[PDB]
Design a protein around this nucleic acid. Structure first.
Ligand code: TTP
Ligand code: MG
Ligand code: MG
Length: 342
DNA sequence: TCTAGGGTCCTAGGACCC
DNA sequence: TAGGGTCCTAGGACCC
């Protein structure tokens, strides 16, 4: 009953698009991200910038101290969305079992596939080659019997490469696999796991499921299963977006409600436009607001509400501003909508 | 260095129902 | 008849 799962992942996706579209950026350190003045972070960087330590999620002021010649780009999301549509059409030439996880990556289930003599290895190579031939961007891939191993595999021969894990190879692969490599095990969980002596899947194999369930709940079960190589999650091609949000961080903290209302007045048209692309009548389940203060604490209040409404969002922002706030600067204002269930 | 914006999923207490 | 299920809501880890 061994499945064949491919995970395909574009290399340096936004930066790779900006280099294709402007080859002057091919050989200098570049990153997509907000300026230091706009208090931004790096969305991604190309390999010349990564050499300096530039990474996604790094504050832009840190990126520039590492890499003073970093060229900073604002990002062209329609160009990225166009590349995404194109690689997803390429995936559809091989299977309809496609679960996109973001613009630039997807799981493919090729168990029942007829192409390339049923070789998942060869299908993944053909997909990478087609992507390069038709988009002039490179992709990496991972092939494994389950989702999470395929996703780990696609990182191991990046860029422009792939890696295959057979069922025979899974135990040796797991034995020394750090837990932080498992998708869903982040910094906070890895630090709690490390503090109790659990660093690798090998360690977690030496653990009692009951203990893990008590200490971590349902996450304890996922940890126990992943460390065994167990991941029965099916490739699901039917997922749908559940929310849409629009938020902005100010270049300077705001301290007056008039400044906050001004911001919302700019955010609301953007939220209406994006909602209307997917729900023309603007009918929704909930709407709400988000404030983030200068001490980085963040609050949201949302409520049942039938149709996107600018004044109610203003009124709700005003309550949050008056109430849970307390004289701090505000760095971010956001609007949010929960979509009607399908 | 000084910390984004797009999202998904889980948890947990109280309201509400039976 | 003392408790079980199910929304509502806020927060936060985590993902790209
Ligand atoms: P990935 O595959 O992790 O992200 C794809 C693109 O999403 C954007 N993005 C990513 C991260 C991790 C983030 O924190 N913020 C983002 O905005 C930019 C990404 O390009 O990232 P990648 O393709 O760039 O890097 P590699 O080559 O390692 O896959
Ligand atoms: Mg990528
Ligand atoms: Mg990706």
């Amino acid at each position: 009953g061994s499945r064949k799962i491919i995970h395909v992942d574009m290399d340096c996706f936004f930066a790779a698009v900006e280099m294709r579209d402007n080859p002057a950026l091919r050989d200098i350190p570049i990153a997509i991200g907000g300026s230091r003045e706009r208090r931004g972070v790096i969305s991604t960087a190309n390999y010349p910038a990564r050499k300096f330590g530039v990474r996604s999620a790094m504050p832009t002021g840190m990126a520039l101290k590492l890499c003073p010649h970093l060229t900073l780009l604002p990002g062209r999301f329609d160009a990225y969305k166009e590349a995404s549509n194109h690689i997803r059409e390429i995936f559809s030439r091989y299977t309809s079992r496609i679960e996109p996880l973001s613009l630039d990556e997807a799981y493919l289930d090729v168990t029942d596939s007829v192409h390339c003599h049923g070789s998942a290895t060869l299908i993944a190579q053909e997909i990478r080659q087609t992507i390069f031939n038709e988009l002039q961007l490179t992709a990496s891939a991972g092939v494994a019997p389950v989702k999470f191993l395929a996703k780990i595999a696609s990182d191991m021969n990046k860029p422009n490469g792939q890696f295959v894990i057979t069922p025979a190879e899974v135990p040796a692969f797991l034995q020394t696999l750090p837990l932080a490599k498992i998708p869903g095990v982040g910094k906070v969980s890895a630090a709690k796991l490390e503090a109790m002596g659990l660093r690798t899947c090998g360690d977690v194999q030496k653990c009692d499921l009951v203990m893990l369930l008590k200490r971590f709940g349902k996450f304890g079960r996922i940890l126990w299963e992943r460390s065994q190589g167990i991941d029965e999650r099916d490739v699901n091609s039917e997922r749908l977006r559940k929310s849409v949000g629009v938020e902005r961080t100010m270049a300077e903290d705001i301290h007056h409600w008039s400044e906050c209302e001004a911001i919302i007045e700019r955010l609301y048209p953007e939220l209406e436009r994006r909602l209307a692309k997917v729900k023309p009548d603007l009918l929704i389940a909930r709407q709400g607001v988000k404030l983030k203060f200068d001490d980085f604490q963040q609050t949201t209040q949302e409520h049942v509400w039938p149709r996107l409404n600018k004044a109610d969002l203003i009124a709700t922002a005003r309550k949050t501003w008056d109430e849970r706030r307390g004289g701090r600067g505000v760095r971010l204002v956001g609007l949010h909508v929960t979509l009607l269930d399908p």
